[PDB]
Amino acid sequence: TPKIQVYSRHPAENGKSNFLNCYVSGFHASDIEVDLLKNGERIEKVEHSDLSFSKDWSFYLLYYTEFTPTEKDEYACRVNHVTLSQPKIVKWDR
Amino acid sequence: TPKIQVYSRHPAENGKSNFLNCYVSGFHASDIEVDLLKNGERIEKVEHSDLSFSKDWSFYLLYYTEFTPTEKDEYACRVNHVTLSQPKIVKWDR
Amino acid sequence: TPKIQVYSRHPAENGKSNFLNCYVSGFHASDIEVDLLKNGERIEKVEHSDLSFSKDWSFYLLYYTEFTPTEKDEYACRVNHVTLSQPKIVKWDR
Amino acid sequence: TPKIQVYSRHPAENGKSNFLNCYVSGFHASDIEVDLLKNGERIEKVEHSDLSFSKDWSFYLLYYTEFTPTEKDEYACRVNHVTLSQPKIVKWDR
Description:
By secondary structure, the first copy, chain A, is mostly beta strands. Chain A contains no helices and eight strands.
């Protein structure tokens, strides 16, 4: 299954603007679906940068969006594919 | 229409191994088709590296393969898309 | 000697914001120096992205700045390198 | 201080060829020094890919080597930086 890493650009501070990132990487998988979730809900208009190499069928995806973390709010990265029996959800931990 | 640049990795020398590259870049175009041609014929098993950014709908594609240029042989890059009325062919010039 | 390409991000339109780029690539960066010029003067607000690989000692540099092209202004890229007898100045061909 | 991640390209299998990676990232590279170690000894056949951006002074370094993991051998990455009181050694957790 693809490697999934979830992290903020700068050290996380409540009420301070930051970037949420989900880095998805691996081999032998096309048409991967990636979403960022806020309190279980899909965040719309998330940007992404995609890199792939045919030589080893590798892919490296970065999904990111500007955000301001708080105590009440929980974030995660949701990855889906045909290879997966169910969407793989990875919670963000500061 | 996408920018297309065709070039060898090292200075071209007849009968000397090298890499043929076609660099295709632009904005607002998905599912672009790229082929390298030898004497008008599609070269099979060409590798490629693909990079794209959603922020500006940009793409940067590098199609490459190992080759040995000669006097008799002519090479080109063929790019196609729905946006194009006909495949755009760009001949390699040493 | 290093390869030098000077180009705008989008087709130039006088009076409209754009980015001017100088892409410098080659092997053995050594004492490489790159600057963008306006009417012969160094542009202050220039940033750069640098990529290098020790395997083949290749380097790929992108020097860039936001700019507003006009009919009267001349832009160029100045490059100095050990392999050059004197600094090379490549004019932006609109 | 710089972020340091040590990992193999594919899941480790004893006796099977793989790549060991040390990914070092942060802001203001300055006098950064990176090495891969086997049983405390510097590995000679290490290459690296370096990416940096002047906009935010970010840097992203990938130091890598082909290796054949075994049960007995210990690998690590050594990093020295101005922001570190002494060089940091991060062991590869298989």
